[PDB]
Design a protein around this ligand. Sequence first.
Ligand SMILES: CCCCCCCCCCCCCC(=O)O[C@@H](COC(=O)CCCCCCCC)COP(=O)(O)O
Ligand SMILES: CCCCCCCCCCCCCC(=O)O[C@@H](COC(=O)CCCCCCCC)COP(=O)(O)O
Ligand SMILES: CCCCCCCCCCCCCC(=O)O[C@@H](COC(=O)CCCCCCCC)COP(=O)(O)O
Ligand SMILES: CCCCCCCCCCCCCC(=O)O[C@@H](COC(=O)CCCCCCCC)COP(=O)(O)O
Ligand SMILES: CC(C)CCC[C@@H](C)[C@H]1CC[C@H]2[C@@H]3CC[C@@H]4C[C@@H](O)CC[C@]4(C)[C@H]3CC[C@]12C
Ligand SMILES: CC(C)CCC[C@@H](C)[C@H]1CC[C@H]2[C@@H]3CC[C@@H]4C[C@@H](O)CC[C@]4(C)[C@H]3CC[C@]12C
Ligand SMILES: CC(C)CCC[C@@H](C)[C@H]1CC[C@H]2[C@@H]3CC[C@@H]4C[C@@H](O)CC[C@]4(C)[C@H]3CC[C@]12C
Ligand SMILES: CC(C)CCC[C@@H](C)[C@H]1CC[C@H]2[C@@H]3CC[C@@H]4C[C@@H](O)CC[C@]4(C)[C@H]3CC[C@]12C
Lengths: 446, 446, 446, 446
Amino acid sequence: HIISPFNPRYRAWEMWLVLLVIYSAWICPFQFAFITYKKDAIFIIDNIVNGFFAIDIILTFFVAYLDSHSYLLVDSPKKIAIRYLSTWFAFDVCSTAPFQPLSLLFNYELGFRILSMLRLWRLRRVSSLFARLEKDIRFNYFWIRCTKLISVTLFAIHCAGCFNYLIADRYPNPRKTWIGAVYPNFKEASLWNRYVTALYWSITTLTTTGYGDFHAENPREMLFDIFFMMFNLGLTAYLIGNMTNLVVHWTSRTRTFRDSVRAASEFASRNQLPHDIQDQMLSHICLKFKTEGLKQQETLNNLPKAIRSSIANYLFFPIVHNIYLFQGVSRNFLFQLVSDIDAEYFPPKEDIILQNEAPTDLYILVSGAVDFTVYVDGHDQFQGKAVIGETFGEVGVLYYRPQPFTVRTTELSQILRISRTSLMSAMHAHADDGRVIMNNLFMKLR
Amino acid sequence: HIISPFNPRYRAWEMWLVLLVIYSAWICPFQFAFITYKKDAIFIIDNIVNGFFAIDIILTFFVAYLDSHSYLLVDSPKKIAIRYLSTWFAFDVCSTAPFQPLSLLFNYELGFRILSMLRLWRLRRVSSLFARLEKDIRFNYFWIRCTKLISVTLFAIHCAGCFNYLIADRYPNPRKTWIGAVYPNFKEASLWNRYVTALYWSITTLTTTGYGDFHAENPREMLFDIFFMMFNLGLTAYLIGNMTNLVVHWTSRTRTFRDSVRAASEFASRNQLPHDIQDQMLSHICLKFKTEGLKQQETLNNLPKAIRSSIANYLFFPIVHNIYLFQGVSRNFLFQLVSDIDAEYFPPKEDIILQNEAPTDLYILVSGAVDFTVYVDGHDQFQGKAVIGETFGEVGVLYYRPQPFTVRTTELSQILRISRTSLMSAMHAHADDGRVIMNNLFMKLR
Amino acid sequence: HIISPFNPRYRAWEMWLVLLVIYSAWICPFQFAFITYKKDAIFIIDNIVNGFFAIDIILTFFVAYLDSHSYLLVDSPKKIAIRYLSTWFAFDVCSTAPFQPLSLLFNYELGFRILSMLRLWRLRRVSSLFARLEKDIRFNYFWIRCTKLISVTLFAIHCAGCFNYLIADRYPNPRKTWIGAVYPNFKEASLWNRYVTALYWSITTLTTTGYGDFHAENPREMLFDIFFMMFNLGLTAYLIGNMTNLVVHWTSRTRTFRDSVRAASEFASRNQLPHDIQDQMLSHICLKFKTEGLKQQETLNNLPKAIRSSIANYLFFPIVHNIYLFQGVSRNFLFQLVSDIDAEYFPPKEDIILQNEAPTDLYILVSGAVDFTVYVDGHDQFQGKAVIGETFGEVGVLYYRPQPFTVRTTELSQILRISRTSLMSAMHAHADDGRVIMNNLFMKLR
Amino acid sequence: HIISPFNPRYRAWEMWLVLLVIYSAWICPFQFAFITYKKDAIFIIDNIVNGFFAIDIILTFFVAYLDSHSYLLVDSPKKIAIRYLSTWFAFDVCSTAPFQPLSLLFNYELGFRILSMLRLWRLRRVSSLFARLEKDIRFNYFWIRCTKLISVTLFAIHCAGCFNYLIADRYPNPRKTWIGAVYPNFKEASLWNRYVTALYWSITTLTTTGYGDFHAENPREMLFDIFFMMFNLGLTAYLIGNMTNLVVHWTSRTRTFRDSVRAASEFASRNQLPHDIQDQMLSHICLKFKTEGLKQQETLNNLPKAIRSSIANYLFFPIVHNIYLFQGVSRNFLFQLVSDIDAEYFPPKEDIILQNEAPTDLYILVSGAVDFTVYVDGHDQFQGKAVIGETFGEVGVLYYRPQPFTVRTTELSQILRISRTSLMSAMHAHADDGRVIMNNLFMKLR
Ligand SMILES: CCCCCCCCCCCCCC(=O)O[C@@H](COC(=O)CCCCCCCC)COP(=O)(O)O
Ligand SMILES: CCCCCCCCCCCCCC(=O)O[C@@H](COC(=O)CCCCCCCC)COP(=O)(O)O
Ligand SMILES: CCCCCCCCCCCCCC(=O)O[C@@H](COC(=O)CCCCCCCC)COP(=O)(O)O
Ligand SMILES: CCCCCCCCCCCCCC(=O)O[C@@H](COC(=O)CCCCCCCC)COP(=O)(O)O
Ligand SMILES: CC(C)CCC[C@@H](C)[C@H]1CC[C@H]2[C@@H]3CC[C@@H]4C[C@@H](O)CC[C@]4(C)[C@H]3CC[C@]12C
Ligand SMILES: CC(C)CCC[C@@H](C)[C@H]1CC[C@H]2[C@@H]3CC[C@@H]4C[C@@H](O)CC[C@]4(C)[C@H]3CC[C@]12C
Ligand SMILES: CC(C)CCC[C@@H](C)[C@H]1CC[C@H]2[C@@H]3CC[C@@H]4C[C@@H](O)CC[C@]4(C)[C@H]3CC[C@]12C
Ligand SMILES: CC(C)CCC[C@@H](C)[C@H]1CC[C@H]2[C@@H]3CC[C@@H]4C[C@@H](O)CC[C@]4(C)[C@H]3CC[C@]12C
């Protein structure tokens, strides 16, 4: 018996009202200044529009809302009328109520047009849409906000141009007005010439060009220009502020990358490192930026540490499920195993593990070739290998001994890292470490 | 015997002085240029205003202040005169002292008007108010500062317009001035036409429109325009800077939210997660933003860790006071218990606790339904439940064993979390853990 | 059989195309408005340019690209045509296709010039270059982006000026146009005068000056100015946003330094420290800023903790290799030793180690003199020394006893710091600590 | 034999050169356009200025500099000539060399004035001063940078005005120039009228007003305005960027404070806390902001942890030196004791320690009254006290028992905090804890 605020009916009703509001807001100054009122072909359409909003006044009592403290619903139509009658009812029933149609049919005009300028309270619904669409996900945020600013700027042009043409009509002596002193016969021309002339006056003093045509002579008009140029100063400052937000935010990523590269280059050229350490640092920052892992670190560390477990369970479980070491290790162990795996990504020709380094982490390959050569003991050649899926670092499992070989990449790779302390934290989950240790003993003895 | 600076008398005295300062600052250029001086109907009011400030000069010796290093008072009127006589006394006694009323009554004028332009030192009190109202809590900060800028801009318009009308009066050959070459008979017109014309000239070169009327011909006036247009360049840059602060600060929250959603969507569409993990991540960020917990985390972690204990004592003590487990647990234990409770809030249909997960935390419900179904062992159906107040996670109290069921939400909930390490930290507070363990044994055996 | 996208041939082919695109984009409005078409001396060059792009349409099928998910190559020409035929093929084959040369040779003009305005789709390659050069390392980032903005601004001036000269030619009554009412005989003048006049009109309404010459009289031209002044408002806001990024980013370092100095001075002058502690704090921040160690800390702590080991191995191994203590300590121990050394840098006259201070760290000198004097026990003189390479702090190795002397610098120095906990972490690497302890015993006994 | 770069002689020599450079840069356009050259009264002064710079060319070989990698000196005049002859020698010896005085005395002019426009290379010294004064401590940073921008803007006005007056002189037909069509007789007027007119033209198109006087008619002049208005667009954007930095940086502190208060108020009014917890949170943030402890925390935690020990040794040693507990505790213990003391500051009426709270820290008063009342057991009244210097929290030294009383402030205080873990860390420093424990036993037994 109560209409939910997420039906397909009510949302299409709102968007039909939004098109109707845009119609009313475009007509109202153009009706206020140029055209007369006694003819009725637009009077019909205005009365129909007032009928639609009078229907909406009734129908907003049947609609549920979303409360702030308790969520997802408010029903039982008490407190709905308390919400609607306190916040938005008074100005809506002032705006919806016809006054010109009663003045026309009762006895009878300028004081009745000002009562028709209250139709602009209907323009809150456009603000409610541009509040919804920023916060909705499935839209470009830097498109909606510039659309909002273009809407406000175009409406300021329109309303100011029509009000100045009004104050040019109502004044005796057509000469010494802004349009009279240039065109001496202007009331006999069409609507398109007068409307384009008013619009052209208004935009040359909004966008602060100000050629020198169409300046003011009438002192009341000379008074209107003071308030309009104050308003244009304020709005132009606001517009430059929004475009500064769009430019600062659109290019933050590339600027932060170039900061990191400048800092690495100053640190390198200060201490005079030869070539190799420079190329390692700069290529490693280039491949941190091509796979943008900084936002990955932040947004993974903002997750509630169970959804990241389901992420790693999707990504790395069939890779860890088939290794040299793990054979029969009881997948209910693997669910608690997988969730601490921290992926990584590595440049080519970066010496990963050097000879006689004290061990720190397991390096399961997921892709990419690896080339191992003797370091210090062997001047050149020798042997060293590992292929997709084939782990290494299995010396420092429990042997606690340094790595035999050198580890230099050939083509780029993706290397998982279950480190030493993570392994020793996995040690207390016993009765399945026996299978791992049997795989170690039968692995190395063969 | 010494007036405190927080009485209701002295604050109303200051605000009466602020209205008097605004009066003096509006009159002084308008008196300096347009009107004469020999008539006395405003001379009376100016002498009365000088009387009020001469009273304030005496009365500021009886008032205490707030020192910088030691707080809350300085009394004993030594060092009050040392403060007042060193900082603000000289220019105040130069501004308050009448010079035109002595020139009028002594013997007698342009050199005496410049001595009346020193009345603008009285305008420090408006700066002191706009320093107080930013730092006071009970006002909108983005309203006060724009009011300050509108005040400075309007006063610049006013003073520049009146000074240019002065330099147009004092020059012989009324033609070849800015107002003379357009209106040849301008000294015979009223005050309102000349004042609106001067104001209209001034605003078309402050807001950089510059139509082309009212340009300068007199070379001294052509010299005045150089300094005024330098000043307008500086002030327009300052105004755009302040509106850039208001726009960058007004929309930081929505922009940060949309950053987080873009980063989550790039991380999802890079690694090709199917649907479910995308919808979990995006709905969890949407419900971190509807209940803005990031500012909560920051401002709770900036608190001195006793007021947050009183906060949690108000919020969660009658909820934890009535549980399945806790029955008679001696509320002086509960005061030390409650202060480490970390609240949270959760989306619907997010799988909270999965089957055979190694346990991490207690999950006391505070609201919201919970639905538990068999995971892996059971393909569908089965049973699992918990209602408002009914805790779960009571397996991993001391049993150290994985959870039996799956835990999927149905409608959204608020779930407290006293985690495993927090429980084991609460273990050393003994002689009341016996009641908890008896409640465990009689709880599970039934 | 497939051309790689990193050959020297294909890159020079692209840059030749970029010069050809700049040629076409400069000619096309200037051809559209001023000159005729029936003559053929430029028609030849345009057909040759269309030939070059028709060659490029074929040749872009033989070129490999870089995929997003898997890197470094895509070969095997399937999916290359799927990439090229879906993204960029349609508008390229619309732009490359000649239509004016077919209109000239088939039967025959304004509707055929608009088909020649589709040559501006060729201007995507300039956007691809200005996307590459920001992300490439070996270029100044704040030079490329301002070059991009100057390019867009100059092209807007050019195209708007030529389009307004077109709409001034095509209108009957040469008077009441923008160039007709000032120059009554303008079609008989040269190209340079008309082109400079159109360019001069366009820039006085792009850069919002607007003198007052050359305003519009024709109502269709009065309509064109509305769209052009809207566009200029948008572009001027965008340009101010980019220069705000350049100014905020160019002076962040000096502003952060001056923040730190202001905060230290307020903390000093609040609590009334006499002189010495002020000069120590301020000179220490000055020598943190002359050797900018903050970016060093950040970019070293962002490194993957093996490249920083190779850095410290290059920088400090021949310094630690020759000390009082270390003599025969088996350089495979030294590789694991060096990587935890944290360098530092110190002001002169800063008291480094005071008398009877509980010990914290080893202080190996690398440069700079050190002067030690008796503290408290000795009023003045006494003795204390250490020279380049000569360590101190060797009391608190295992003696766990306070330092004997005071340590005040004379000229500035660079002092390594292997602290107490780092030494005790190095203790478990035994069978070579015996040599260190023998060097201690024979060191102190002599 | 080598002049140090920090003598009082050489710095005064540099500042005399800076005044001479400002003289040359102001004269050179004004000499280039207005005045003739054959008279000699300024020719003398120009030759003298060239003599001063020819002396400086020699004298810059005797001066030491500061190297980048090794600091504080470079002597031994090899590599000084390598620095000076590579970087700055060529353009200095081109600028210093006279060419007009040789043209005047050799045989003989426009091509020789362009050789005199190379005197503007001498203007690097003003850039070196405005690089030094930002980085020097004893100057306001937001004053120097705005002075730099005003200098560049005024010089742009000056040079552009004089160059346009040149291009107005050199053209035949004095009518159809910018100054000719308004003043038909302008070459017969003085210097002040022509100079003010050129300056007034230049500033109305720098500050984008553009009245409508003084527009261009000569096509070469119409070409000059294009480059000058491009330059003014660029410079106006740069100026707005710098004022945006000054406004964003000048009001960051108050804006951050108001952020914290808004976040605390939203967190309070969301969860509906009654009054007391709101007033505690808001008054505690107000007294974190009146004594700005956030910058204190940052800049103390950036210190090298020995200077902060000397700070706490100056601030708190004679306060801790005289307590209830500590009597004879051997001040060489006190030097290691003091350095971990963390000061704090507290609002009035904030309940500091509640009844039956598990203890956390010692609370030595340094000022401010304290009032203790019974909590829960006692409804009202009771007793509780502590005065300046009199510690409390001495229950939980080793008794590990909750506090007896409640602790509510009356007037604001400053309370040191040596916490529980800091005390237990001080426990291993024995052979003087016996005196503390004797003071405990004789303290409580009395
Ligand atoms: C041709 C006819 C077209 C008709 C269709 C157009 C009708 C759309 C109408 C939408 C209206 C809602 C837009 C809104 O809500 O107003 C923004 C605020 O506007 C300002 O800047 C006002 C600064 C004033 C300048 C100071 C005055 C100086 C004294 C919110 O911006 P926010 O900060 O994002 O919330
Ligand atoms: C019609 C009559 C109305 C009379 C009533 C109005 C009188 C009110 C008067 C209030 C005055 C106090 C306002 C203040 O203190 O001046 C702000 C600073 O102003 C600037 O921008 C000055 C930039 C100059 C531009 C460079 C010059 C270029 C060479 C502080 O701003 P802050 O940074 O927030 O401290
Ligand atoms: C004399 C002849 C010279 C011819 C040579 C010049 C041709 C070069 C041509 C390069 C073009 C690529 C440059 C680009 O891509 O367009 C930037 C975007 O431009 C804007 O600002 C457009 C704002 C519109 C204002 C709103 C309109 C208001 C309704 C990207 O900027 P981004 O943000 O960095 O990506
Ligand atoms: C009346 C006679 C007075 C004579 C005395 C004055 C002589 C002083 C002369 C000082 C000069 C050094 C100042 C400097 O170095 O130039 C700043 C940079 O200037 C710009 O903005 C240039 C933007 C160009 C706009 C693009 C052009 C668009 C195509 C550095 O600013 P920075 O970023 O802080 O380094
Ligand atoms: C002189 C002339 C330029 C005046 C134009 C000013 C407009 C910018 C004014 C006229 C009516 C105003 C609207 C009417 C009230 C609206 C409801 C409010 O919840 C949001 C702002 C809201 C949408 C206003 C925005 C600003 C408007 C559109
Ligand atoms: C050419 C014309 C536009 C000059 C107007 C400049 C004004 C903006 C000047 C005139 C007098 C100045 C005021 C007088 C001194 C005031 C005391 C000081 O503690 C705060 C600034 C303070 C309030 C000044 C602000 C700027 C004012 C109001
Ligand atoms: C009224 C007149 C000023 C219009 C000029 C507008 C120009 C600024 C428009 C005209 C053609 C447009 C270009 C054509 C399409 C181009 C491909 C796109 O991938 C990047 C933008 C891209 C390069 C456009 C940038 C903006 C241009 C250059
Ligand atoms: C059209 C007219 C407005 C041209 C004026 C442009 C000035 C802004 C140019 C003219 C000469 C230029 C100066 C000459 C070279 C100087 C050395 C360099 O290390 C710093 C910039 C440096 C100081 C330049 C700054 C910009 C100046 C002062």
